[PDB]
Design a protein around this nucleic acid. Structure first.
Lengths: 836, 183, 183
RNA sequence: UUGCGUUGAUAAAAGUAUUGUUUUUGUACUCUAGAAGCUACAAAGAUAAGGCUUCAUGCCGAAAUCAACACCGGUGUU
DNA sequence: AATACTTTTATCAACGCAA
């Protein structure tokens, strides 16, 4: 006789338990978890399919080097000159002879920039930039842009003799193939070592592209993101395993909407729902099926005229038809069958029934030439389709995009073949036939069925946490009599199906929150006592630990540093730079005055070119940069005559340098860093010599994939380096590790006082053994709240950062289960876990 | 192993190799110089034979691996027993020759066993240097928890802007073709 | 390898193993103690972390081989990173366990190249000990005239009063037979 | 709750283009053939730290799963 | 890092027609 009550929220779940007779409070707690925001898999998917572009670009360059090396043209690749002009070499080698090194630079600059290929306001600009390709290659266009305007790449506006307009470096990849073919034909006329297999291999390197239904991989690479699966199979179309299953047979794929069986079912079910003054017989049904099959032009109007003349009364007497948006008569015909009868090379009249279902599976899935030309080989019988037939159905499916791009039926052919003999004779719908035919963890409740039917990502996490709470409660306190809860109907049906198939009756129910707000208005930690109210209608905390190791280690932005003396330095220190982009923009001028007022010498321009800083000091004084821009043009540099370059940006000494990763190149002169490095966990050590604790701190960036096997670990020598830095002696002993949201008990040893916090991180990496603590009961730790006598006060901002290398404290680790029953440990193992 | 002025020149040369700024080296825990004491030690001032044993054996361990401290004793053995080597070159050039000969014996006898990778060195503030050296090991002498018994540590001096490839075959083939640009 | 309080005990234990009198050890020209300072060092009066580098490395070079200082470094890593190893034994017992582990791993893989020999450790009396330790080495890592790259020394704790059989095959069979006694 | 027909949102996965940040080199600008490395432009390398084998339309690396230990999908306790 | 382009599969909502 116990009652379970749950409060299912966004980021927390409350749970309470009653006894239903005396009404005593047995248990009450709250599970706290992060809310599953959908912005994180977007960043992971964006960077996953954004590293593949860089990888395949580099592999194009590698394949080009192997092509030049194998055909004997170039032996070593060390002395190729970086400082030539590739565009002049392309336009020159159209009609001259390039001596095996200019050809390399030309073809490499070609494969580094190929073009768009989807054309077989942005499209208006590619329309403007494509009319000059009727007589010129793109190399000629970019060369005239280079020697007329000076600037080639990017997107940039300019004023010609007529009018100001826009230039963009996007050309279609047909013109690059034409230009490369002309270049290689001329060089074949000069150099007799360019074979036709050389130019064919280069042209397959240039314009090669995978298709959207192929995905990554190779025959022997075997990734599980495209076809060529890790199980040894090979798909034809990686969307062909995403097709949903049948409603009443959960092992059969669905049927294509333009098959024979689906249209037969749709017409046989469309006019059994039609009442004529009292349903149509089997003979007239077979007649109307043969009349809509053997007819060149059918419609929804001629069907109503034909049934009106077949039952001889009139047209307007009939009711039961499906109306439209604008009120009409809509009814299924054999639209894809009448349309597929317009094929002169292949005859479908004496063709089979299942063959008309695989032809609609292939024409519904595959949309391109190579897809349909490849999916007619494996599935169908060997032969059975000549090449002219294949090309005619390819241009048939390309001509009918609205008919074949409809989708997939909600049943299967295996089920729809069990109803078509039935709804001939007995005039009924599909639901009454399926009703009169009846198609339709061992102790605990498994989560795979119930998360399957949740699709909002915030709700499914709360549902799984509530399921885990229910599983722990019925493991601890026997069984209940009521399970009351708080997307909603499906957990009701799931718990009802679970308890119904287990021959034990418990009342599982939902209740509305308006009733509970009414109860709180009438009757007179926030989740706990409200869940007790839910269980009354008929504390302890349990946080979720974050212990995932491969996360974002740092930014991807590359920063530049300089060694300077800014302000009150005694010696040269390293400084992270910044940059004001687009000085003419209003935010650029506000940021320029922001840098300029507090320190004039923070700019790099003021220290190295001071003369031209006496040409920027007048437009800020007597004129601000956008007015000078529209008056005389851009704010050019200082020279004797006006040919100095323009000014669009200004870089300055931003800040001092803190946590970083040093990724300076080989031949560099200044230090080049990555910033914003985040912590992961902390290990706690203790030594009996002094009698105080020591605390390490690891980051996400400290681990790596190791060098022989690829496993993700940190070695022991690097671990000893981190131990030497953080002040941990070598004869200390290891207590435990703390991840995020772990409960940490601090106890004083002189006056026996106890508190417990949540671990957050290991801040301030200049002092030693400093740790940031989050509160146990609440979620903000706001104010100047006091603490126990040895730690001190919470700071003014609301951030508790305490140095736990004290003289009297003692530190324990708390492991709470889902219900919150705390187990206090003091020694985890002999050795901290480093291999994953 | 002997501690003398040749060990001081070896420490100064390898410190100049792996660290771009000297502040990262002499302010490490265990070494812990000041600026005046560093400018005294670097300019021939203070003796190394009278220094602390812990400080010298902490300067020797950050720059050399635990196997490369075996080839310093054997290099000193073969170097103080030959008049044809003492007059020509200093000690660190002979040490580089010794290390390269042992690498050549590794590549000759045990070619399908040589693995390698990029090493990272921790500076005086804790922030490491990604790709500070190239570490080369023998996989048969694996020891446990990602540590090796026979290990070396090189640095590439190349002019072409093309990094060292990954995988066992490409990296071993790069080391076989560029056996002059690593010191 | 570090220099701390657990290195002095290893030095004293190995000196008690190899030398029959302490006066043969602390009067060697690299070490050069006096009888007051030697008892001050042997009783705990001085700090090994602040001693001169040449003297400490001369002691460690006289007692140990060039290859076994690499094993001292690796054993220090594995020893200080584990809890039961730290708090169940002294360091020299785990060092002898490490040495025996590497010896059996040497015999297990390629036993056809393991050779051995006798050891003559010089003293401060003009004479020496003719047979105090047994050398075991690998034929593949041969350096020069009589130098071996990979080499270890052991001591016979057998109580059968039998001398060493000379030759390769018989000594290999004897060290394989007596694998549980030597340390 | 099962089927059909339109219009709106969301989720998951795939194929491309052009730039952005930074390093070196070249020309221009500046100061006396040198220096300075600011301001432009053009090439070549890198783009979360890193790693793999199958040698190539090559592949993986920023999400989710979570109380531990002991005894044969279940059973025990700080 | 941050804008342009192309494609597929699934799930909810909202209206209409059989039940």
């Amino acid at each position: 006789d116990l009652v379970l009550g749950l409060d299912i929220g966004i980021g927390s779940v409350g749970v309470g338990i009653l006894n239903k007779v005396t009404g005593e409070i047995i248990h009450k707690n709250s599970r706290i978890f992060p809310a599953a925001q959908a912005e994180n898999n977007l960043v992971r998917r964006t960077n996953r399919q954004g590293r593949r572009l860089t990888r395949r670009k580099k592999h194009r360059r590698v394949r080009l080097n192997r092509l030049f090396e194998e055909s004997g043209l170039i032996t070593d690749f060390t002395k190729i000159s970086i400082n030539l002009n590739p565009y002049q070499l392309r336009v020159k080698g159209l009609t001259d002879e390039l001596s095996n090194e200019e050809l390399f630079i030309a073809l490499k600059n070609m494969v580094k920039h190929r073009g768009i290929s989807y054309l077989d306001d942005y499209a208006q600009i590619v329309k403007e930039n494509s009319k000059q390709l009727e007589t010129k290659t793109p190399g000629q266009i970019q060369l005239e842009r280079y020697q007329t305007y000076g600037q080639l790449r990017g997107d940039f506006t300019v004023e010609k003799d007529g009018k100001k307009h826009r230039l963009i470096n996007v050309f279609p990849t047909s013109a690059y193939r034409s230009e490369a073919l002309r270049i290689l034909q001329t060089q074949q006329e000069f150099n007799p070592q360019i074979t036709d297999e050389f130019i064919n291999r280069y042209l397959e390197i240039l314009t090669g592209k995978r298709k959207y239904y192929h995905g990554p991989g190779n025959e022997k690479s075997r990734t599980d993101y495209g076809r060529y699966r890790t199980s040894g199979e090979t798909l034809d179309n990686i969307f062909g395993i995403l097709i949903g299953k049948c409603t009443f047979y959960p092992d059969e794929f669905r049927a294509a909407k333009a098959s024979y069986t689906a249209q037969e079912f749709n017409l046989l079910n469309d006019l059994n729902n039609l009442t004529v003054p009292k349903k149509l017989s089997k003979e007239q049904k077979n007649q109307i099926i043969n009349y809509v099959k053997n007819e060149k032009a059918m419609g929804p109007a001629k069907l109503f005229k034909y049934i009106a003349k077949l039952l001889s009364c009139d047209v307007a007497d009939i009711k039961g038809y499906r109306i439209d948006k604008s009120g009409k008569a809509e009814i299924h015909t054999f639209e894809a069958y009448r349309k597929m009868k317009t094929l002169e090379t292949l005859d479908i009249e004496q063709m089979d029934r299942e063959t008309l279902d695989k032809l609609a599976y292939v024409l519904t899935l595959n949309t391109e030439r190579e897809g349909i030309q490849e999916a007619l080989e494996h599935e169908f019988a060997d032969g059975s389709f000549s090449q002219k037939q294949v090309d005619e159905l390819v241009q048939f499916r390309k001509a009918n995009s609205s008919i074949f791009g409809k989708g997939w039926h909600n049943f299967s052919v295996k089920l729809m073949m069990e109803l078509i003999p039935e709804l001939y004779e007995t005039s009924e719908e599909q639901m009454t036939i399926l009703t009169r035919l009846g198609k339709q963890k061992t102790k605990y409740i498994d989560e795979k069925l119930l998360t399957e039917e949740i699709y909002n990502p915030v709700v499914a996490k709360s549902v799984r946490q509530a399921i885990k709470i229910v599983n722990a409660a019925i493991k601890e306190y026997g069984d209940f009599d009521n399970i009351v809860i708080e997307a909603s109907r499906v957990v009701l049906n799931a718990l009802q199906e679970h308890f119904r198939a287990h021959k034990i009756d418990t009342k599982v129910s939902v209740v509305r929150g308006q009733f509970t707000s009414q109860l709180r208005r009438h009757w007179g930690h926030h989740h706990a006592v409200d869940a007790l109210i839910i269980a009354a209608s008929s504390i302890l905390f349990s946080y979720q630990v974050d212990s995932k190791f491969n996360r974002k280690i740092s930014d991807a932005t590359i920063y530049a540093t300089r060694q300077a003396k800014v302000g009150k330095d005694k010696a040269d220190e390293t400084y992270v730079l910044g940059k004001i982009k687009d000085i003419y923009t209003q935010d650029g001028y506000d940021a320029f005055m922001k840098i300029y007022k507090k320190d004039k010498s923070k700019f790099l321009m003021y220290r190295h070119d001071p003369q031209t800083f006496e040409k920027v000091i007048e437009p800020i004084l007597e004129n601000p940069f956008l007015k000078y821009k529209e008056e005389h043009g851009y704010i050019r540099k200082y020279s004797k005559k006006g040919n100095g370059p323009e000014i669009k940006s200004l870089k300055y000494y931003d800040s001092k340098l803190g946590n970083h990763i040093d990724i300076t190149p080989k031949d560099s002169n200044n230090k080049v860093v990555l910033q914003s490095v985040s912590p992961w966990r902390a290990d706690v050590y203790f030594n009996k010599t002094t009698g105080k604790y020591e605390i390490l701190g690891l980051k996400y960036a400290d681990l790596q994939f190791e060098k022989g096997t690829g496993t993700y670990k940190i070695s022991q020598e690097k671990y000893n380096d981190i131990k030497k830095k953080e002040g941990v002696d070598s004869d200390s002993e290891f207590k435990f590790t703390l991840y995020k949201n772990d409960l940490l008990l601090v106890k004083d040893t002189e006056t026996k006082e106890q508190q417990l916090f949540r671990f957050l991180s290991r801040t301030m990496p200049k002092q030693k053994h400093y740790v940031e603590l989050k509160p146990y009961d609440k979620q903000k730790f706001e104010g100047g709240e006091a603490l126990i006598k040895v730690l001190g006060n919470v700071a003014n901002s609301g951030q508790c950062k305490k140095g736990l290398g004290k003289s009297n404290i003692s530190i324990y680790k708390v492991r709470t289960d889902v219900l919150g029953n705390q187990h206090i440990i003091k020694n985890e193992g002999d050795k901290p876990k480093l291999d994953f | 192993m002997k501690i003398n002025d040749d060990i001081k020149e070896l420490i100064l040369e390898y410190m100049s190799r792996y660290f771009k700024f000297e502040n990262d080296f002499y302010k490490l825990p265990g070494i812990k110089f000041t600026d005046a004491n560093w400018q005294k030690f670097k300019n021939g001032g203070t003796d190394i034979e009278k220094m602390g044993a812990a400080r010298v054996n902490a300067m020797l361990d950050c720059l050399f691996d635990d196997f490369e401290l075996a080839m310093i004793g054997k290099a000193q053995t073969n170097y103080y027993n030959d008049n044809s080597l003492k007059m020509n070159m200093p000690f660190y050039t002979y040490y580089d020759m010794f290390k390269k000969q042992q690498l050549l014996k590794w590549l000759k006898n045990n070619r399908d066993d040589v693995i390698g990778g990029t090493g990272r060195m921790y500076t005086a503030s804790g922030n490491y240097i990604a790709n500070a050296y190239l570490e080369v090991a023998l996989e048969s002498s694996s020891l446990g928890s990602g540590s090796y018994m026979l290990q070396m540590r090189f640095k590439d001096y190349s002019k072409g802007q093309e990094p060292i490839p990954s995988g066992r075959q490409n990296r071993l083939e790069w080391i076989e073709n560029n056996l002059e640009n690593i010191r």
